[PDB]
C-alpha cells in the first residue's frame, strides 16, 4: 500500500491508494550521509509468476465462464476481480473444438489479447478487462479550475494531461478535460484513460500525475489507432 | 417518522431570507420570486399525501388495491355465482336470464365488464376488502393456529365470531351474527383469505349465531344454538 493525497489545514483528507505493493527490491543509499531506501514493489506480481492453471475445457462452453476459470487460478494468488467488459463479438461466441491449457497463465493471457483484440490488466491486485475500442464507466474532470497544469496536451488520438495527483485516476476510465486552448484545438472533452504516471515528493516536487488518453469518438468508441499486424 | 414537510410559505420565506440587501425591499422582484417558488413548493406538498394514504387501517380505492397486490390478494376472484347485473327488470318483472342491481350492491357489474364476463366477482366495498387483506396477513405468515384464526375472524366478521371444532381435517367457524346480503355474497371469498392450513376444509355455522354447549366462553339457551357445519363452496360449484 502506497497512499497518496492532500491534507489541507482545513478541508479534510484526500488520501487514497495509488499503488498497492508487493515488494520487488529494496536498497539503501548514502548521499553525504543520508540513507534513502529505494523500494520497488509488485503489481499482481504473485500472479505474474506463481499462477498456473489446469484445464481441460469442452466444446459448446460460452466464452466467459473460463475467464472465471483463469481467474480461479489467478485468485489462488490473491488477485481480485475488477470490471469485465468483453467485445460484443466475444460475448456471443461458442465452440467447435477443444481448448488446450498447459503452462503459464500470463503468457497465454497475452495471446488471448492478441487473438481477440481486447485489453486485460491488473490495477492494484484487481484485474480488469475491456475491449480495444471501449472503456469502463467512471468519469473524472480536469480543468484549470479542477487541477490542470499547462496544456491538455494534444496527440494523434487523444491527449496527455498533467495535474496534481488526486487519487481517483485509474486506467480504463473516462476523463473530461477543459481548458482555454482545446477549444481552438477543436479537441473533445471525453477521453479514455490508457496510461497513468505518478511522480511526486513530500517537500519540493509537488504531487504530479500525467494521464494519456485516446479520444472517444462520436460513436462512444475509442480511437484505437492503426494496429500493425 | 414525523412531519415530513412544512408549509410552503415557510420554505419560500426561508429562501427569501437569502436574497441580497439591495433587493430586501423590492416588492415587485420579491413577489415575483415568491410567485415562482411558492408554486413549486405547493406542488411538492402534494406528495406528503403519499404517506398515510397506504395505511392499512385507513386506505381506500387505488391505495387499497396497491396494498392488496403487494399482499397477493387481488380485489376479484372466479366463483360459481350469478353476480347481480346493473340494469332494469323491465319495471315490474321480466323473465330474462340475469339478476339486477339497485344502486347499493357489492355485485356492481355490467354486461360488458371484463371481470364479469369471466365470472370474477370483484370486491368493491373498502370495508370488506380491508378485512380480507387483514386476514390475508395471516395466510402470508402461516399463522394457522386458533389463537390467530380467532383474530382473523374478529376482523372479518365481528367480536362474536368464533372457531368451534377441530375434527379430522375439518374446522368450523361462525360469525356470531346474522349476515347481511353483501357479506353472504362475499362469503366464498372470505374462505380464500382466512388462515386455514391447506388440506383442511373450512366449514361455517348455519345460522351464523354463537354456538352453544358448556364451559366458560359460549352462549346458553338465549342466544346459542346447536352446531351444524355446512360447506361454503369456496372453491367449487359442487
Amino acid at each position: 500500500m502506497l497512499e497518496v493525497g492532500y491534507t489541507p489545514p482545513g478541508g479534510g483528507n484526500n488520501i487514497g491508494i495509488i499503488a498497492k505493493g508487493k515488494i520487488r527490491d529494496y536498497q539503501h543509499d548514502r548521499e553525504g550521509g543520508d540513507i534513502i531506501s529505494t523500494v520497488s514493489c509488485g503489481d499482481g506480481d504473485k500472479a505474474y509468476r506463481r499462477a498456473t492453471i489446469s484445464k481441460t475445457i469442452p466444446k459448446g462452453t460460452p466464452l466467459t465462464e473460463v475467464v472465471d476459470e483463469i481467474h480461479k487460478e489467478m485468485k489462488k494468488e490473491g488477485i481480485a476481480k475488477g470490471e469485465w467488459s468483453f467485445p460484443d463479438k466475444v460475448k456471443n461466441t461458442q465452440l467447435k473444438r477443444p481448448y488446450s491449457m498447459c503452462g503459464s497463465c500470463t503468457r497465454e493471457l497475452d495471446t488471448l489479447g492478441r487473438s481477440h483484440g481486447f485489453y486485460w490488466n491488473i490495477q492494484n491486485e484487481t484485474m480488469e478487462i475491456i475491449p480495444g475500442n471501449g472503456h469502463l464507466p467512471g468519469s473524472l474532470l480536469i480543468t484549470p479550475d479542477t487541477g490542470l497544469i499547462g496544456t491538455p496536451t494534444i496527440t494523434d488520438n487523444g491527449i496527455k494531461v498533467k495535474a496534481l495527483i488526486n487519487p481517483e485516476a485509474r486506467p480504463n476510465r473516462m476523463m473530461k478535460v477543459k481548458s482555454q486552448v482545446l477549444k481552438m484545438n477543436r479537441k473533445g472533452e471525453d477521453y479514455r484513460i490508457s496510461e497513468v504516471s505518478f511522480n511526486g515528493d513530500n517537500q519540493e516536487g509537488d504531487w504530479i500525475m500525467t494521464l494519456t488518453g485516446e479520444a472517444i469518438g462520436g460513436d462512444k468508441k475509442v480511437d484505437e489507432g492503426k494496429k500493425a499486424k | 417518522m414525523s412531519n415530513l414537510c412544512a408549509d410552503p410559505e415557510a420554505l419560500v420565506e426561508a429562501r427569501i431570507d437569502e436574497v441580497l440587501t439591495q433587493y430586501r425591499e423590492s416588492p415587485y422582484l420579491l413577489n415575483l420570486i415568491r410567485a415562482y417558488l411558492s408554486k413549486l413548493a405547493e406542488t411538492s406538498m402534494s406528495y406528503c399525501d403519499m404517506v398515510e394514504k397506504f395505511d392499512l387501517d385507513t386506505a381506500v380505492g387505488d391505495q387499497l388495491t396497491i396494498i392488496g397486490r403487494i399482499l397477493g390478494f387481488p380485489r376479484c376472484h372466479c366463483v360459481c355465482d350469478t353476480i347481480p347485473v346493473v340494469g332494469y327488470d323491465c319495471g315490474g318483472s321480466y323473465a330474462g336470464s340475469y339478476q339486477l342491481a339497485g344502486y347499493c350492491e357489492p355485485g356492481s357489474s355490467w354486461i360488458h365488464c371484463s371481470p364479469y364476463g369471466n365470472s370474477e366477482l370483484c370486491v368493491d366495498e373498502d370495508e370488506i376488502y380491508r378485512s380480507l387483506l387483514k386476514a390475508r396477513r395471516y395466510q402470508m405468515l402461516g399463522l394457522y393456529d386458533i389463537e390467530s384464526l380467532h383474530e382473523a375472524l374478529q376482523i372479518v366478521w365481528g367480536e362474536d365470531a368464533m372457531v368451534a371444532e377441530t375434527k379430522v381435517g375439518q374446522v368450523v367457524v361462525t360469525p356470531g351474527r346474522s349476515l347481511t346480503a353483501t357479506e353472504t355474497r362475499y362469503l366464498p371469498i372470505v374462505f380464500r383469505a382466512l388462515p386455514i392450513a391447506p388440506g383442511i376444509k373450512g366449514m361455517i355455522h348455519i345460522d351464523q349465531g354463537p354456538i352453544a354447549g358448556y364451559g366458560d366462553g359460549w352462549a346458553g339457551y338465549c342466544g346459542g344454538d346447536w352446531l351444524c357445519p355446512v360447506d361454503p363452496h369456496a372453491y367449487t360449484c359442487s
Binding site: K183, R186, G217, G218, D219, K221, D223 | -
Partner: protein, 106 residues
Amino acid sequence: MIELEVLDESKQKFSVILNDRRVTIELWYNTTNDRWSFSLALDGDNVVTGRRLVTGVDLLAPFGLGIGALFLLSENGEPPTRANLPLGLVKLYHATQEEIDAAISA
C-alpha cells in the same frame, strides 16, 4: 445524438467519428447570400461539396453515405445566419440511423 460546435469563424474545419468513420466537415460562410455551406470528406475523399446548411432536414439524405443524419435545428425555425450559427441560436446535430429509427417508432 451529438451536438457539433460551430466556432465564430467564417471558415472552419473539424473531424468527427460517425458510425465508425473518420469524417472531415468543413464549413464556410457565403457573404454574398448570407449563408453557410459545408463540404464533407469520408476518409480523405470529398464526397460532398458546396451544400447549403438549411434547418429541419437531413442534409445527407441524397447521398447514401451510411454515416447517419446531419441536420440543423432552432427554437422557431430561424435560418442559420453568420451571427446565429456560432451563437447556438441555431444548432447542428448528428443522429444515427438507429436513433432515427427508434424515434420514428416512438
